């Protein structure tokens, strides 16, 4: 399988791992890599969104760029640079793409929306501290906010859209309005406030204004995955104690029509949204996963045990490698093995 990697010290590891490759097993074949990139700490990797084939790898010093992996080896296509004032106090917590637009949202509500090819940028300002934002993949130009003591609220550039909007109209600071703001669940079983700390937002509408009744589910640092709705109201439609370690990553498995999650202690486990229970866990991981990317019938978990697994829809471990460094994000390129 073709899959690209990048660690906290900036360098890019480009792996050609295949099925049956357990690097702990001496009788298995060795990993095939073509490593490059900067070896310094300051250009350390944070995120690897996947434009249709171009990887857009950001960095801690703000060197967000465009890497095309069609060429062997990948060669830098284009490069962006951000001002150092947005690096002084703020830190980068997200980067997502939908309809020729690229956010680079920061940890104080600064929303640097950069266009891909037209390069006309639009910055936005929001409420208190952020920890995760996301774009509605189906309807263009809908944002979701979230952070500690900043519960989920849906700022939207165009509230109606009705199918799509022209790109240059998108994300003007005059038209972004919150069409949804969350309302907390009731008090606890001892009459204590359910403190809110949103850590990740995923839009569940695939697996459950034209095209209303937005459906999404969020995770919390306190360990309670919560689903949501708009037609039902502003309270969460369901609350579960899926784990107790702070939940770090949430996402979809589009081939099972099902939604997984993860945590700090590597309880990466799929979750039945229909039977309201956890169905299966990704076993073998011993260490905090840093990022997980999914594509089709396979997933890749990169963890602070310095490994990259390949699990599937049926949580069967395919490939297991070692990567010599502390990774930060993993991206899957080819679902097929090395011989295809």
């Amino acid at each position: 399988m073709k899959l690209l990697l990048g660690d906290e010290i900036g360098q890019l590891k480009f792996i050609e791992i295949k099925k049956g490759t357990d690097t702990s097993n001496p009788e298995s074949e060795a990993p095939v890599i073509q490593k490059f990139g900067e070896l310094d700490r300051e250009k350390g990797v944070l995120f690897m969104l996947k434009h249709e084939m171009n990887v857009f790898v950001a960095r801690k010093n703000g060197t967000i760029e465009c890497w095309n992996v069609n060429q062997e080896p990948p060669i830098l296509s284009s490069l962006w640079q951000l001002d150092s004032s947005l690096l002084e106090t703020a830190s980068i917590v997200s980067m997502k793409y939908s309809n020729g637009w690229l956010m680079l949202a920061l940890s104080d509500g600064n929303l640097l929306f950069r266009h891909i090819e037209s390069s006309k940028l639009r910055k936005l300002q929001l409420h208190g501290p952020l920890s995760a934002v996301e774009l509605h993949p189906r309807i263009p130009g809908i944002i979701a906010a979230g952070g500690k003591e900043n519960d989920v609220c849906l700022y939207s550039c165009n509230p109606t859209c009705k199918s799509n909007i022209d790109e240059l109209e998108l994300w003007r600071t005059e038209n972004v309005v919150k069409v949804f703001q969350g309302k907390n669940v009731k008090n606890d079983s001892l009459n204590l406030r359910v403190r809110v700390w949103i850590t990740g937002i995923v839009f569940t509408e695939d697996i459950i204004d034209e095209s209303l009744c937005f459906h999404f589910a969020t995770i919390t640092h306190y360990g309670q995955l919560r689903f949501y709705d708009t037609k039902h109201g502003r309270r969460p439609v369901s609350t579960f104690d899926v784990s107790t370690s702070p939940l770090s990553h949430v996402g979809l498995l589009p081939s099972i029509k099902l939604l997984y999650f993860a945590d700090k202690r590597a309880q990466i486990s799929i979750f039945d949204h229909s039977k309201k229970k956890v169905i299966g866990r990704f076993q073998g991981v011993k260490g905090a996963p840093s990022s997980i990317h999914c594509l089709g019938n396979v997933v890749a978990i990169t963890g602070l045990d310095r490994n990259v697994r390949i699990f599937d829809a049926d949580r069967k471990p395919l490939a297991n490698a070692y990567i010599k460094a502390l990774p930060t994000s993993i991206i899957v390129i080819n679902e097929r093995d090395a011989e295809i």
Binding site: D188, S189, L190, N191, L192
Partner: protein, 190 residues
């Protein structure tokens, strides 16, 4: 139908009784004092009134003769307000003209159920250590493999093997101060 169900269950055998040594205790969920007394047992006493929490909010459970033969519908319920002076004034207005002994119990089991929530809430908000279990199978394995791994390192021997190598390589000034005058010349010979 009351002394019948006390000379059977109070003196022969009741499945809730606990033979203590200075007392006897009742394991019923609708006991107001916890003990298996005559004026306390919820089976003999056929008009009763208890207070017992259920998921944060304290309730009041009451029974009568005229619902005794309907075990599903036997106990009714009233939810007691958060204000402690309101709850006492709501026990009395529901338990009116009941004996003074019984209403005494409910108010005492309201003082005792509020102190449980006013404590377990503060107790839950403090940061307190983690009671984790010890395991005899995995502390007899450690003690077994320790002494097998302590003597399997020649702990003292590998210290001195490199200690001279730390000397002989010369990490200290040529003539150091931790060595006597004679055997350093052997290192010069080395």
């Amino acid at each position: 139908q009351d002394e019948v169900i006390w000379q059977v269950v109070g003196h022969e055998f009741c499945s809730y009784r606990i033979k203590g040594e200075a007392q006897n205790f009742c394991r019923n969920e609708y006991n107001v004092t916890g003990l298996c007394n005559r004026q306390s047992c919820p089976l003999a006493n056929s008009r009763y009134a208890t207070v017992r929490e259920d998921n944060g909010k304290l309730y009041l459970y009451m029974k009568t003769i005229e619902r005794a033969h309907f075990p599903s519908k036997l106990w009714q319920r009233i939810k007691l307000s958060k204000n402690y002076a309101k709850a006492l004034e709501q026990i009395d207005q529901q338990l009116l003209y009941w004996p003074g002994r019984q209403i005494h119990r409910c108010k005492q089991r309201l003082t005792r159920l509020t102190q449980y929530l006013l404590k377990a809430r503060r107790l839950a908000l403090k940061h307190q250590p983690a009671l984790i279990p010890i395991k005899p199978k995995q502390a007899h394995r450690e003690a077994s493999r320790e002494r097998k791994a302590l003597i399997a390192a020649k702990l003292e021997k590998n210290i001195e093997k490199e200690l001279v190598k730390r000397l002989k390589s010369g990490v200290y000034g040529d003539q150091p101060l931790n060595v006597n005058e004679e055997i350093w010349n052997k290192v010069l010979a080395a």
